[PDB]
Amino acid sequence: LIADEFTLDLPRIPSLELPLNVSTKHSSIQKAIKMCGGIEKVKEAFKEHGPIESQHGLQLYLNDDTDSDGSKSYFNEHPVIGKRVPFRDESVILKVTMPKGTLSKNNNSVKDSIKSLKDSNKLRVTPVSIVDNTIKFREMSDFQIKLDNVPSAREFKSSFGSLEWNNFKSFVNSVPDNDSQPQENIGNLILDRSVKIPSTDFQLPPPPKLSMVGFPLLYKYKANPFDVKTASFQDIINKIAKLDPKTAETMKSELKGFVDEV
Amino acid sequence: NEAKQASIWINTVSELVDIFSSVKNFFMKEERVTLTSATELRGLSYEQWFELFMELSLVIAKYQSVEDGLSVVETAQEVNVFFQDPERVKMMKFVKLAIVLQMDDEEELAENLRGLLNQFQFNRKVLQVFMYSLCRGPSSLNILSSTIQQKFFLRQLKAFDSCRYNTEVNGQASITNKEVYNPNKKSSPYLYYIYAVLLYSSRGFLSALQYLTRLEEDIPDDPMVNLLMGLSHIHRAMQRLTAQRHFQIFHGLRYLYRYHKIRKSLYTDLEKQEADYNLGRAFHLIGLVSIAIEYYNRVLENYDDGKLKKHAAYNSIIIYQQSGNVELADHLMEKYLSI
Amino acid sequence: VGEDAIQRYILKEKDSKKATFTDVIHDTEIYFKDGVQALIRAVVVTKSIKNEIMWDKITKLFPNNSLDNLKKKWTARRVRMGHSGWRAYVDKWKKMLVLAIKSEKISLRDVEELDLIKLLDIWTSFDEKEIKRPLFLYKNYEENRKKFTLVRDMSSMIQREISSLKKTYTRKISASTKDLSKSQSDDYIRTVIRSILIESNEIEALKNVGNESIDNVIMDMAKEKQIYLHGSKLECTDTLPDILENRGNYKDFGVAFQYRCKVNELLEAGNAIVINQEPSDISSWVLIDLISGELLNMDVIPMVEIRTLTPPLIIYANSQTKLNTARKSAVKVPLGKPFSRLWVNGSGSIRPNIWKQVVTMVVNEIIFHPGITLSRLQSRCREVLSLHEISEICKWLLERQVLITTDFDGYWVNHNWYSIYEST
Amino acid sequence: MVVNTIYIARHGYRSNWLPEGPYPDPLTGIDSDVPLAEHGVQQAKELAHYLLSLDNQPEAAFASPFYRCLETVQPIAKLLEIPVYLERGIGEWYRPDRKPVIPVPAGYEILSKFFPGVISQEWDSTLTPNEKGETEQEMYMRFKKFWPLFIERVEKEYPNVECILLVTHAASKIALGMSLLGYDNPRMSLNENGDKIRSGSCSLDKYEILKTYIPFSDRKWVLTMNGNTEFLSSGEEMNWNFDCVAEAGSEVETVYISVDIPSGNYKERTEIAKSAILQYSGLETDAPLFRIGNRLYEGSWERLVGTELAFPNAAHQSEKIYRIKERIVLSNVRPM
Fold this sequence. Notes:
The structure is cut from a larger assembly and holds chains A, B, C and D.
Chain A: E1 6-7, E2 12-18, H1 26-35, H2 39-45, E3 58-60, E4 80-84, E5 91-99, H3 102-105, H4 110-115, E6 124-137, H5 151-161, H6 165-174, H7 233-243, H8 245-252, E7 257-260
Parallel strand pairs in A: 2-6
Antiparallel strand pairs in A: 3-4, 4-6, 5-6
Chain C: H1 3-17, E1 30-31, H2 36-49, H3 55-58, H4 68-79, H5 82-102, H6 108-112, H7 116-127, H8 141-147, E2 151-152, H9 157-166, E3 170-174, H10 180-197, H11 213-223, E4 227-230, E5 233-236, H12 239-247, H13 250-268, E6 271-275, H14 281-292, E7 296-300, E8 313-317, H15 352-368, E9 372-373, H16 374-380, H17 387-399, E10 403-406, E11 410-413
Antiparallel strand pairs in C: 4-5, 6-8, 7-8, 9-11, 10-11
Helix pairs in contact in C: 2-4, 2-5, 2-7, 10-11, 13-14
Chain D: E1 5-10, H1 38-53, E2 60-63, H2 67-80, E3 84-86, H3 108-114, E4 119-120, H4 136-157, E5 163-168, H5 170-181, E6 204-209, E7 221-228, E8 252-260, E9 277-281, E10 289-292, E11 295-298, E12 301-310, E13 318-319, E14 322-329, E15 331-334
Parallel strand pairs in D: 1-5, 2-3, 2-5, 3-4, 8-14
Antiparallel strand pairs in D: 1-6, 6-7, 9-10, 10-11, 11-15, 12-14
Helix pairs in contact in D: 1-2, 4-5
Protein name (chain D): Transcription factor tau 55 kDa subunit
Subunit structure (chain D): Component of the TFIIIC complex composed of TFC1, TFC3, TFC4, TFC6, TFC7 and TFC8. The subunits are organized in two globular domains, tauA and tauB, connected by a proteolysis-sensitive and flexible linker.
Subcellular location (chain D): Nucleus
């Protein structure tokens, strides 16, 4: 008795390998595609072509909830970038066709669900498609900065992110027609004290890409293959005191002597 | 009932906007139907009509469509009584930008931002709206990395130096904001910062360190200036031609640890967690994977807030996957990245 | 308001928030020229013997264009068979060539002189021995096993990104028979053979081993190029010595140990170290380790060109806090019957050189791979150590606190990891 | 030989199957020659996209000339851009005692009004059903006679057509398949576990030769696809077999697995050849055996370190997204 000769003429379909544990519910699979920007973005991302260095790819947000004012729950999250696999070895998708409630009795494993029906005629298996294009997330996540307690970031999120008209009027009416102190800290304008911030912080907003490389660099503790030595202890502490006497006085009061690393 | 409430509210306002739009004396290329209506038109003041046009455009973009939001603001930009008032044109440009932010049109965003920066010269709240409007993705990096943006900001920085020293600087932008008061001749930290970002975000690390050191002289105890210096040294040290590689990495770690001390001491637990996460990510960037796992573990084990835990788990998964420890990667996946 | 509103609310919630909300195991819809074989064999014969495709001589075998159609058709043909097909051709050629030399069907001088005509005639005359139809499967699993005894079988940034995207990470639920005892004993024969051949009237460790097994292992080592053989003297090939000499850099660990002690004494004495030039590759380990532990404070000697962005750096201890680790305990080296481990010789003594090399080698692979498991680690060291020998090395390193066990049985390098032994 | 792939498909969902009316009368005026319901309007368009996605599309389509069958092939003919021919030989079955009458199908001249440019007349029928209706024995003999004549007409009327589509009826589909395979009667099971050719709404089969003119009577046909219905948003419905007494139209916990064929290098792609066939044995075991064309393979059961989502609608209101998590990684095998 020969084993059934199934077709491989089948449709070729795209795939997405998420570095997430997506449960079987519609709510879960829906939330997962929303983290990538919706089904339009995912389908478009499979159609990108050209040198891998240039591909914009798909952007994944690990935090993407929405607050009561409709603003993003984590404005500023730099995304995990995914790209199409350059050479995806083709694989066949098989449909396994169990009786109702077989999967749960087998601790949700398909292996055990096959083995627990070894002699049955009910358990159909058939090939359904070949996959030959896949997006994988594989580069590191960028440096993340938290703006939850930065005064100007809260004013921006609660206006330009919420689209609330009361907040938007209050915001634009507060923007000076001309700024007389562009040299001074923005905290002098934004009075709000509900947030702990030091006056040494200028509320400088963070850049859209901090790690200019998605993969770790090859330092490997190797040097690249491609004079204070004469000074006295008093001369060295005097040079430090030229910029800040506090560190110089602290050093003189504590240290016993310099050493050249030779 | 919020989505339906927005639809019902839009449905009441659409009627009022139909009754105001059917006055073709304003909308220059239902006829020239209105003459001599001094301050109120069809029973409401021109101020109330301006307010209805803006509130409608925002509710339309929030609950129904971004392009429909722009069509409403574009009608506002064409109305003479709105165009003729300096307070209204200011408001109109910001409401337009806010709708543009929700569509991925890079060129539109870039042109709106350039318009506001030409108008409100040297203004701090506007410079922050510029950077915050550019916080995420390749679309915003394309804006900051463009040579157009590097030249534009160089010219405003030269114009500020002209106001700061009372002299003509070659290629300076015209001084539209003559209201500046800077008796101690200070830099504008925001201009020097944004210029350092434009260079950094276009791989000019040597140039980024110059303007960042010029910020250190004014604001040495700022978390971001410190971080951006540390990362500049690390990336700089990794280029082909840099001899002194080890020494530059030690300088990198010096500034990252300064950021670390600043964040961990003067702010709440959210920032403490951030400090541990970012510092770990720096060791990862360098390739010192063994040290990175300590910091990521602190992010996971010491604190309660889950937002950064996902990132700490994700990078740890990449490390453990390369180390062949698939079982730990799967435990992390279920514990932190589950849906 | 009547009960109908409460029931409509209850129904809307039941229709949208039920515990058994719509799954995917059901409801799977979600809304939002004829000599081409002679050419292949000529590429295999040339690239296997001479290590390269000798196109100049292949052109003189089967008449075609000067390089172009041969090179184009070969390049087009290989992509239809892939690495799997290439290995099938190479494995078959190697098998035919050893059988031919074993039966003397060619004289070795003809191989050296590259007589492609004779060499291709060898596969020709061998292919005349068997024929078969494309295979088929029976519906009963056992029946296939009865009918057939089937046989099982550092770079640039963009190349790393390409490679990292192709890999799949998967957790093995099951496979064929574990066969652990035979595999373990076979590797124990590898350990004992290597432990003989690495340096030096009886052998003790092989006494209990079956006399049939030794033949298979010495043969496998010959195929894997690990040995040479004079008329009755085996020798190790330079691969085992070189892998230990390159990966076992214990002379560097000796320098790192001295440098850590100098730094510890200076910093505890309240001195400050000043750096103005690049620390060497060894001083790099010990400095980043101390910095990473938050034990050292850093300050900078300011200046006033490019050089202003790279001023001399000063380092010092934060307070009364200690830098030296606690005194060493008597963690004994794992030892046994003579030759039973790579580091144990015939007089039953520790080879201090080999022990210093293997401990350095195992720590070197665990540094950059935090969490590495014993199974993964054996794969990277297969040309040197058996799994049992790595269980011995990892246990000793855990007892000396050089490593910490991650959850799920992985190894992770602790601070002060370079402090293994005094030397240099 | 020319014809080497035969496709057979059941017509769409009939208007008389709905839970409530008003049920529309036959527009062709022939008894029981009812129109397709909205389910048939959608599902015939699905099958057109599905057949367009396969890299082995038909080059000619033969309809049983009943209105429901020609209506079913109309979107196929439009979207695939292929010629349609009548063939009454693949016609419906009616038992001899049918009341009120045995219906006879409409002709090309009137069908041309309902199907302008879709239908073509350069093919007369190979043979035709008895006007007094047919016993199941005479019915099966009709299909037994049909096949050897039909292919010898197809391969001479057309010089190079290799793949053909038949659109037809539940009894006809099963009888055509069983006779193409050669069984003594169409009530037999294909195998001792009791499988039969399925025949639900829009259900499709594929028949192919195993791996110069050789008689069609001498060739052996393999049933390589046997009631494929994955491309239907409502799945297979209204299934029927010769075990049913009545004439046609008058709990499945599915999970997905990926079988991967990793190549020993990163700079290259493992490609499955176009005309290949799959066989397996032992999925219940920890080392299943798989055939994919010429090569044999042995697996290993593995769980993915993440979740893989596949989008079948995105082939080269709702998406049929598959979750993939268990995998069978195939290592090569040498026969010994």
